[PDB]
Amino acid sequence: TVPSPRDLQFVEVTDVKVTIMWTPPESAVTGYRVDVIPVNLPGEHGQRLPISRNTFAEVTGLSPGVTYYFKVFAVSHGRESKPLTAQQTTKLDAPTNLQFVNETDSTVLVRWTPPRAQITGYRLTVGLTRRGQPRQYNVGPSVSKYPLRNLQPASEYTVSLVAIKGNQESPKATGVFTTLQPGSSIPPYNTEVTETTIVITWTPAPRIGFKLGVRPSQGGEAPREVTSDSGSIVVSGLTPGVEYVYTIQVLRDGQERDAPIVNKVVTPLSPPTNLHLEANPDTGVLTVSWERSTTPDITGYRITTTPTNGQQGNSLEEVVHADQSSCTFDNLSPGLEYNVSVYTVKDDKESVPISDTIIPAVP
Numbered sequence: 108t109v110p111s112p113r114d115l116q117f118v119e120v121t122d123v124k125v126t127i128m129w130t131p132p133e134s135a136v137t138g139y140r141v142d143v144i145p146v147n148l149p150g151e152h153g154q155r156l157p158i159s160r161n162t163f164a165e166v167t168g169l170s171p172g173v174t175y176y177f178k179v180f181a182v183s184h185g186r187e188s189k190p191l192t193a194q195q196t197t198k199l200d201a202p203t204n205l206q207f208v209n210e211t212d213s214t215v216l217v218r219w220t221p222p223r224a225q226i227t228g229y230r231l232t233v234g235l236t237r238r239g240q241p242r243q244y245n246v247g248p249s250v251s252k253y254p255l256r257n258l259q260p261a262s263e264y265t266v267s268l269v270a271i272k273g274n275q276e277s278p279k280a281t282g283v284f285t286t287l288q289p290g291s292s293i294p295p296y297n298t299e300v301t302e303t304t305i306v307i308t309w310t311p312a313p314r315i316g317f318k319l320g321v322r323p324s325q326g327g328e329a330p331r332e333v334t335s336d337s338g339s340i341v342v343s344g345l346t347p348g349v350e351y352v353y354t355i356q357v358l359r360d361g362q363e364r365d366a367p368i369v370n371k372v373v374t375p376l377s378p379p380t381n382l383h384l385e386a387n388p389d390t391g392v393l394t395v396s397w398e399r400s401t402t403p404d405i406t407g408y409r410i411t412t413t414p415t416n417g418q419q420g421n422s423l424e425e426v427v428h429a430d431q432s433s434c435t436f437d438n439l440s441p442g443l444e445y446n447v448s449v450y451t452v453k454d455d456k457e458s459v460p461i462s463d464t465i466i467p468a469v470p
Contacts, residue, residue, distance in 0.1 A: 110134045111188035112179050118163065122171035122200040122224070122277075123455045128163035129179050129191055137182045141166070145422075146174040146194060152411050152424035158182055168409045168426035168452070171200040172224035172272055199224045199275050200455050202268050204372050205282035206298060212260035212287040218252045219268055222277060223457070226270045236263040236283060260289040282371065291365060293357050298370070302347040302377045302402075302458075307355060311338040316358040324350040324371060334358060347377040347402040348453055376451045376458035377402045379432075384447055386467035391441065393467060396433040400451040400458065405429050407452050412436055415444040415464065426452070441469035 110132035119126035127141070138158040143166050145151035151173055156164060169175065175197070178190035200222040208216040217231070226248045233255060234241020246253055246268075258264065263285045270277035287293060296309040296317070307319050319340045322330035328349075331342055336358075345351065351374065356367040379397035386393045395410055408431065411424040425434045439445055444466050451458035 109136070109181050109183045109186050109188035112139065112162075112181050112191040115177065115179065115191050115193040117193075117195050119165075120195060120198060121455065122198045123169050124165065124167045125169060125175070125177065125195055125197065126163065126165045127177050127179070127193075131162060132181055132188070135183065137184075139164075140180050140182060140187070142176070142178040142180070142190070143169075144176040144178070145170075146176055148173060149417075149419045149422070150413075152413070152422045154424060154426070168424060169197050170224070171197050171222065171277075171455070172226075172275065173197055196275075199226065199270050199272055199277035201278040202229070202270055202280045203456070204300065205266060205268060205280050206300075206372065207266070207282065207284035207370065208296065208298065209284070209287050209293060209368060210295065212289050212291055213256065213258045215255045215258060215264075215284060215286065216252060217255060217266065217268075219280060221251055222270045224270065224272060224277070226272045226277075228271045230269045230271060230276075232267045233264055235259070236265045241265065241267075258286050260286050262286050284370075285366075285368070288366065293365070296355070298353075298355075300372045300374060302375050303345045304341055304343045305345065305351065305353050305372065305374075306342070307340045309338055311336055314360045316361070318354075318356045318358055318363075318367075320354040320356075320367075321345065321351050322353075324352045345374055347374050347400075347458075348404065348456075349374055376400070376405065376453055376456060378451050378458040378461045379408065379449050380461060382447070382449060382461045382463050384463055384465040386439075386441075386465055388441060388468040388470040391437065391439070391467075393436045393439055393445075393447075393465065394433060395436070395447055395449065397449050397461065399429075399432055402451055402453065402458070405451055405453045407431070408434075409450045409452050409457065410434050411448045411450075411460075412439065413446045413448075414440075415446050418443075439467055441467040443467070 141156040181188040229246035316336035320332040448460035
């Protein structure tokens with residue numbers, strides 16, 4: 108009979124990571140192994156951590172806003188103790204890429220990318236950067252844009268947006284914008300950002316054009332700056348996962364007669380490509396491999412397996428470092444269909460996955 112550890116403590120709790128530590132039993136122990144199991148959600152994925160002599164464990168690759176069981180087993184003489192078990196809910200992740208479109212000198216359209224967690228609403232705060240207290244707006248959980256009105260012209264505003272889920276609040280997404288000078292008419296424009304492009308679109312008009320500059324906010328790449336009267340400018344060749352300052356300036360009769368509009372955005376992470384699944388019927392292990400993501404400075408990859416038949420409890424995931432272009436899954440039922448997905452991971456951010464299905468041949 109192996110005595111169990113004691114006093115489970117939560118050292119770090121973020122949206123994607125939980126660090127736990129515990130007190131050893133008063134007996135000689137080979138090491139500890141940690142299981143992480145979702146409490147309520149069947150679509151979520153668990154993890155099994157290898158044995159270690161450390162009295163703490165850092166668990167990453169968790170889903171924001173999800174409750175997990177954390178179970179610590181002591182190991183001795185090849186036998187395991189009863190688990191030391193505690194529950195923790197991860198925090199919410201913040202909305203990303205607050206974007207602003209100037210419509211008039213008093214109206215601005217706010218846009219953003221919703222967080223990964225399931226939410227019940229947003230709290231949107233907008234106020235003059237250097238004057239007074241900001242207004243607050245209650246925003247619904249399904250929307251990704253909000254119109255602002257009665258703004259002071261030629262004035263800089265500070266904007267914050269937090270996601271809400273019941274009593275839980277995410278960290279804030281922040282941004283700044285400056286309204287147009289009074290009475291100024293700019294053609295209606297729209298912006299979109301992808302992994303490698305920043306695009307501006309508008310309806311062409313005689314003697315009106317746009318200039319779009321893009322440069323990395325942290326430096327490291329040469330700046331870009333091009334113009335067009337065609338109604339669209341596509342700046343491609345950008346690096347995924349990088350913060351870019353992009354500047355828009357209207358051109359009237361080929362001349363710059365209005366102040367430039369300054370914006371900031373982070374390009375989405377790029378997924379891995381060329382996913383391959385190979386199942387060995389004689390050993391029972393599945394090998395997953397991919398071509399590295401084109402995103403530099405990622406933190407790793409997250410690999411999930413899910414049976415396509417809605418089964419529960421057979422949903423494990425693996426987190427690997429960025430030098431790994433492969434991983435293996437051991438106990439998958441042969442003859443059954445599994446969906447395997449691989450995500451590029453950078454801190455609490457993830458790419459869209461690359462996915463494929465496999466039927467392990469039952470020997």
